[model samples]
Target: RTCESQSHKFKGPCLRASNCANVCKTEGFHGGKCRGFRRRCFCTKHC
Candidate 1:
């Protein structure tokens, strides 16, 4: 299984995957990427 978390502190559009991943790391997630048309940071991890 997998888990996900949306960025709460990430400001502006999720344009940089590296930036998202960094924030996700602080949030206790494995990594993150931009998702959907809204370009939100979606963090991922093994569940």
Candidate 2:
């Protein structure tokens, strides 16, 4: 899908522990906040 088509809702496949931390950092968040936010989105696509 296009960047515009992507949604913020996607929680994605379960990430590896290290990768999860990396993803959160890349998105400028720390710990559970980022993961919990993604878990609540309804769009089912990557942000």
Candidate 3:
């Protein structure tokens, strides 16, 4: 499914992709990434 959702727990720009993954995992997602420029935390998982 590849569903992506902005992380509510991760505030500010994400500098650490690994850390973001943890937060995303905590949020009940399967994966995560930092969106360029704005660098917002985006969580991803199967829909």
Candidate 4:
């Protein structure tokens, strides 16, 4: 199976994909990227 989630730890506009992924890694997610007009961090992982 698979799982996906989002985070706002980066705050404001998530302009950097690497930064978002770094925080996501600490949160136990495989990786992440900036998404949507609000610029949120969308993380993904295999469940």
Lowest lDDT block of 10, candidate 1:
3-12
Tell me how far the alpha carbon of residue 25 in candidate 4 is from the true structure, in angstroms, after superposition.
Answer: 0.6
Output the TM-score of candidate 2: 0.33
RMSD of each: 1.1, 9.7, 1.0, 1.8
Clashing pairs for predicted structure model 3, backbone only: none
lDDT of all the models against the reference? 0.87, 0.36, 0.90, 0.80
State residue 8's C-alpha deviation in candidate 4, in Å: 5.3
Predicted model with the maximum TM-score? 3
Per-residue CA lDDT of candidate 1, range 1-47, in tens?
88887877777789999999899998888898988898899888897
Model 3 bad stretches (over 4 Å): none
TM-score of 1: 0.82
| lDDT (Cα, tens digit) per residue for candidate 2, span 1-47 | 31212223336653344444444445443422222434332222233
Q: Roughly what TM-score does model 3 have, to 2 decimal places?
A: 0.85
- Model 3 clash tally, residue pairs: 0
Question: What's the TM-score of every candidate structure?
Answer: 0.82, 0.33, 0.85, 0.76
Question: Could you give candidate 3's per-residue lDDT for residues 1-47 as a string of tens digits?
Answer: 68888999998789998888899999999989988899989999888
Q: What number of backbone clashes does candidate 2 have, counting pairs of residues 3 or more apart or in separate chains? A: 0
